[PDB]
Amino acid sequence: DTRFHSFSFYELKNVTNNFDERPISVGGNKMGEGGFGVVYKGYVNNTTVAVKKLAADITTEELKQQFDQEIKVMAKCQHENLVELLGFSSDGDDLCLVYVYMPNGSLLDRLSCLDGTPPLSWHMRCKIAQGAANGINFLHENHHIHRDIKSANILLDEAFTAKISDFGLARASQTVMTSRIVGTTAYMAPEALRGEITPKSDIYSFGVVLLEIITGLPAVDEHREPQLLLDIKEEIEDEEKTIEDYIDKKMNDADSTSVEAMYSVASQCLHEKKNKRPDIKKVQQLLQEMT
Ligand SMILES: CC(C)(O)[C@H](F)CNC(=O)c1cnc(-c2ccc3cc(C#N)cnn23)cc1N[C@H]1CC[C@H](c2cnn(C(F)F)c2)CC1
Structure with a gap:
């Protein structure tokens, strides 16, 4: 220890x-x-x-x-x-x-270029996603559910190595329920919003983070239509929109093949039924095959 x-x-x-x-x-x-x-x-x-x-x-x-x-x-x-x-x-x-101290702050803040930091390249975003999944995998291998995965809790050191933070809500890994629902609403799986505690909810929240990484958009923006990034994902899957319509324009190196590849991972993470989502080990493998 x-x-x-x-x-x-x-x-x-x-x-x-x-x-x-x-x-x-x-x-x-x-x-x-x-x-x-x-x-x-x-x-x-x-x-x-x-x-x-x-x-x-x-x-x-x-x-x-x-x-x-x-x-x-x-x-x-x-x-x-x-x-x-x-x-x-x-x-x-x-x-x-x-x-x-983490010299590059949170992923959420670097995606919004808070305080004038330069936009992250697509190449860097892919490495950050892989690093974040590696941290979640370590947590799950050690039987911890995070319960608050979001880009504000993914921090970045001097070389932009991704580091999971904030374990105050962590729980050890029948259906486990709680009477005190906690988390950040725009990232939570449906079962988590109703009081279920399961590592499969971490996977769903990570899918939202992959959408933030692809689009540069926060999971919620009260001044946006739709306010919730999850609603934007439904417009793509119902084919009124494509993921290329929402790729962050503050990038110059996003090729469509690997972007669709990480969107594919996010879409699998975002299955409504928790038992159809990949586990974190599979998410790791898919993110490595993408690069
Ligand atoms: C570009 C710069 C030069 O400006 C560069 F950025 C400066 N460096 C920083 O800013 C920064 C530096 N080291 C940390 C750090 C290190 C370990 C931990 C652990 C824990 C927990 N546990 C929280 N921090 N931490 C966090 C930092 N920034 C966070 C941004 C996200 C914030 C946050 C979290 N949640 N929310 C909201 F969703 F509730 C907002 C919290 C501070």
Whole structure:
């Protein structure tokens, strides 16, 4: 098991400049956020780190469970396509998780060219998809269901190696149900939206990510018609549209054969009936044959 450093909260306040909320793009410390909390940049002993400060739908006890679960999963799972936890703080009424900093942020943000990063090439997108599937495969081989696969949780290091993140909702792998449905609605399998817990839902959410990679479009955009990227996929499969109509135009190296090949993988991942989807091992093989 990996051993982690227990920081005092006041130390993490110092390294994040008191959790400075200005974007790092203008010299602040804020890197991203959501319902989970906020992630900040800092330096610990010259090491660049990401500090996730958890925010309070969920009881304090429940939030503590997700904090404990992330530490337990990260203690057991070390792999080059997973992020790496360094430490944590839990003194007082705050919970912080400290990771090795990811120089290229999230896949979601690089697909939207947030803060002016250059568009990803098709060649790079294929390698990122393969890397992400390799990380999910490691998780599933070690009997963890992620439950929140999405492009915001696929991070990118300096060489754009893909790294799965956010294991606070992970569960061990009859039909297992829960009374507390969690996840990000635009990526979830239908059975996951109704309380089922199964690794086959990770495959469905990964299919949505493949659509984000092909199109450059986020899974949901309230200002778009259709708002949901899954609705766009139904227009293709019902033949009013083709996947070539939606290929990201911010690419100059997308050949149609491999694009249709990864769309084929996504379409198999997106089967409504969970038992017709490939398992992650098959998804790995299909993505390797595409390149
Ligand atoms: C191009 C640049 C120079 O600007 C470049 F980008 C800067 N580097 C970063 O920005 C950045 C750097 N290292 C991390 C990092 C490393 C390990 C972990 C683990 C965990 C968890 N657990 C979260 N981060 N992390 C994350 C980063 N950025 C995320 C973007 C997505 C955000 C997010 C997650 N979910 N949501 C929403 F869907 F809820 C939004 C969270 C921060």
